[PDB]
Amino acid sequence: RGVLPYVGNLITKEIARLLALEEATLSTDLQQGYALKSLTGLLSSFVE
Amino acid sequence: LESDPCLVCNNPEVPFCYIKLSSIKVDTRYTTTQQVVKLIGSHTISKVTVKIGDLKRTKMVRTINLYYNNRTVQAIVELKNKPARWHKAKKVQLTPGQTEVKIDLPLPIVASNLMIEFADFYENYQASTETLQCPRCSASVPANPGVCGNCGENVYQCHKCRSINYDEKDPFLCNACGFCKYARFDFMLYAKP
Amino acid sequence: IIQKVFASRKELLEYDLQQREAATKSSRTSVQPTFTASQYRALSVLGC
Amino acid sequence: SWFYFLSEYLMIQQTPFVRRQVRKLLLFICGSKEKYRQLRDLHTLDSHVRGIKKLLEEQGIFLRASVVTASSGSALQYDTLISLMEHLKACAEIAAQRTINWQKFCIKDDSVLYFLLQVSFLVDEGVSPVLLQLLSCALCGSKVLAALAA
Ligand SMILES: [Zn+2]
Ligand SMILES: [Zn+2]
């Protein structure tokens, strides 16, 4: 049904957001990367 | 109960306070005329007030040198090395007979290890060096060999830890325990964590 | 722990900036980009 | 030329004998005591401002026409800040003592107050109070600061 491009696009978008945040500020976030970790794990689950 | 800690709210405005050096002290070393101290952590020092008690006319300090650095070490002897790893903070000259001195730092210094040197001494050479009072029984002993004829004890030995400084016969500070006879020095700090 | 992490991040960023500036000033064709007084505060670790 | 070189000599350290004699002949030559005090104040402040400008010159901070521009994004070091602070503390002391002379300077040399305001953005948080004190002495006034201190 075409969920692989969806997950890939989500991963690329959140990585771009992470880079944009990294360039500008220096604040901390204890939950950073949780969504990306989950999406990558889901993609691996679809791929194995 | 907040997920993202707010830098505005976790950082209040802590004011400066008067702390005695020995309370932050962790480790020290003493040589003939220099003193190395390590604190529990880092501190923003603003003023250092130094008090002198039980001073002797024979010798005291004319110029005091203060050094600092913000590199954490586990052994004092490692950081005892003179030239490479210190930053000078202030040079203070003392009029004769001073008991208290106010080393005012124009900029507060962030430091973890500190260094105090007696750069120059106002000295009284009228003291008799050929004949010295015995540290044990107060008997007059000649300089050579320095062994008392009343009790058989040495003169160059420390009055506190009984260590003989064979290198410097008359050191300002003891090389083993750091006992000083010429004066007793106390340190204050206008600092904050 | 958050304050300690923030201090470490600040110093690491300042060292990276100094190293990059030292590498850039070695090049001759590339001219140094001037910053106004406000741009310096925007760029430096002052506004962090 | 007499007042110039004479005040230049007074700031040079020497034995107190020549300093006392030179002060006496200063208070003689320069009309009256207010005049010699004003001349010393103005000369000292001009020298201090030149020192500050050269110090910032050394590290890439350039005041071209009225804008202060920086070439390096890296902050300044402790020695630079201490050398800035000595000059600024002398200026702040005199401006807090006799504000009229400081105001007269700021009138004659128009690129001082704006330079201080621009440089306050580049120096760390430990040097902002003295710069703001100079700005307040120039603009807010002396009697206002005295009333505020009450
Ligand atoms: Zn004896
Ligand atoms: Zn001893």
Side-chain angles (χ1 to χ4, degrees), chain C:
Chain C
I1 301 175
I2 283 307
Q3 282 180 5
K4 267 296 292 324
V5 162
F6 187 82
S8 296
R9 297 243 174 100
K10 267 197 341 189
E11 171 105 4
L12 187 80
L13 205 30
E14 91 84 9
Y15 177 86
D16 250 20
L17 210 47
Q18 176 102 349
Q19 264 314 299
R20 184 221 320 290
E21 277 203 0
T24 312
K25 67 103 181 176
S26 168
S27 67
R28 303 265 58 80
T29 68
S30 71
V31 66
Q32 192 62 225
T34 169
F35 312 133
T36 186
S38 69
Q39 275 175 0
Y40 170 87
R41 164 143 284 178
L43 176 58
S44 185
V45 291
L46 291 183
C48 277

Side-chain angles (χ1 to χ4, degrees), chain A residues 29-30, chain B residues 4-5:
Chain A
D29 231 327
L30 272 309
Chain B
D4 300 356

Side-chain angles (χ1 to χ4, degrees), chain B residues 133-141 147-155:
Chain B
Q133 203 174 188
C134 171
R136 199 186 183 183
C137 62
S138 313
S140 183
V141 192
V147 184
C148 181
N150 195 13
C151 61
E153 281 262 3
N154 201 320
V155 179

Side-chain angles (χ1 to χ4, degrees), chain B residues 116-190:
Chain B
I116 298 150
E117 142 195 45
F118 309 131
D120 191 25
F121 283 134
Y122 176 24
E123 301 202 350
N124 196 5
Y125 283 97
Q126 301 161 11
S128 172
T129 61
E130 297 177 356
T131 55
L132 299 170
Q133 203 174 188
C134 171
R136 199 186 183 183
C137 62
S138 313
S140 183
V141 192
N144 267 333
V147 184
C148 181
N150 195 13
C151 61
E153 281 262 3
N154 201 320
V155 179
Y156 335 108
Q157 69 180 355
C158 175
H159 305 354
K160 181 185 176 187
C161 71
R162 285 82 159 150
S163 64
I164 317 159
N165 193 184
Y166 311 95
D167 300 332
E168 186 166 342
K169 314 307 289 171
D170 197 8
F172 193 77
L173 319 160
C174 167
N175 210 6
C177 84
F179 158 69
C180 176
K181 183 256 292 183
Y182 286 161
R184 279 78 183 156
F185 280 13
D186 282 313
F187 299 96
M188 214 37 54
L189 306 161
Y190 196 25

Side-chain angles (χ1 to χ4, degrees), chain A residues 2-48:
Chain A
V3 302
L4 290 207
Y6 199 55
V7 177
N9 207 280
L10 288 173
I11 293 171
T12 43
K13 191 212 301 307
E14 57 80 31
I15 272 172
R17 143 181 189 289
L18 250 182
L19 272 192
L21 164 155
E22 185 263 6
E23 153 214 291
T25 63
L26 211 136
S27 325
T28 200
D29 231 327
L30 272 309
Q31 303 195 359
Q32 213 141 32
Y34 183 82
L36 161 50
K37 168 72 191 176
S38 303
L39 277 163
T40 314
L42 184 122
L43 196 48
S44 170
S45 209
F46 274 117
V47 165
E48 48 209 291

Side-chain angles (χ1 to χ4, degrees), chain B:
Chain B
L1 266 275
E2 227 81 60
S3 48
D4 300 356
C6 184
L7 293 191
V8 180
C9 309
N10 311 37
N11 310 30
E13 194 183 354
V14 41
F16 277 134
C17 308
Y18 277 110
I19 306 312
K20 79 190 195 27
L21 203 186
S22 324
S23 60
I24 336 179
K25 164 162 171 23
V26 163
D27 204 1
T28 174
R29 97 171 300 280
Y30 298 146
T31 193
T32 70
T33 54
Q34 275 81 25
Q35 153 168 359
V36 175
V37 183
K38 143 166 54 183
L39 320 154
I40 187 67
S42 301
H43 272 276
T44 302
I45 316 168
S46 156
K47 280 185 284 187
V48 173
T49 37
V50 180
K51 304 287 294 296
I52 304 181
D54 198 1
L55 83 160
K56 307 303 175 39
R57 164 65 261 171
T58 55
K59 258 193 229 173
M60 67 318 298
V61 197
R62 179 184 282 113
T63 305
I64 291 181
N65 281 347
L66 192 39
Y67 309 76
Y68 79 90
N69 64 326
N70 195 7
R71 193 107 172 139
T72 53
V73 296
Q74 54 96 21
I76 296 305
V77 193
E78 199 269 339
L79 203 90
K80 157 82 194 173
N81 281 349
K82 304 172 284 186
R85 48 190 65 191
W86 291 103
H87 313 286
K88 189 94 162 44
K90 175 74 85 173
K91 163 233 165 75
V92 192
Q93 64 271 16
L94 286 78
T95 40
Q98 276 309 105
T99 169
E100 50 93 23
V101 286
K102 315 261 189 73
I103 314 179
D104 48 341
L105 271 305
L107 255 192
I109 82 181
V110 167
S112 65
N113 317 326
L114 297 155
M115 176 64 237
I116 298 150
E117 142 195 45
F118 309 131
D120 191 25
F121 283 134
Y122 176 24
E123 301 202 350
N124 196 5
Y125 283 97
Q126 301 161 11
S128 172
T129 61
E130 297 177 356
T131 55
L132 299 170
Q133 203 174 188
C134 171
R136 199 186 183 183
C137 62
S138 313
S140 183
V141 192
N144 267 333
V147 184
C148 181
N150 195 13
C151 61
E153 281 262 3
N154 201 320
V155 179
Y156 335 108
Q157 69 180 355
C158 175
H159 305 354
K160 181 185 176 187
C161 71
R162 285 82 159 150
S163 64
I164 317 159
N165 193 184
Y166 311 95
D167 300 332
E168 186 166 342
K169 314 307 289 171
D170 197 8
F172 193 77
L173 319 160
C174 167
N175 210 6
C177 84
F179 158 69
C180 176
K181 183 256 292 183
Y182 286 161
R184 279 78 183 156
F185 280 13
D186 282 313
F187 299 96
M188 214 37 54
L189 306 161
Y190 196 25
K192 86 186 162 183

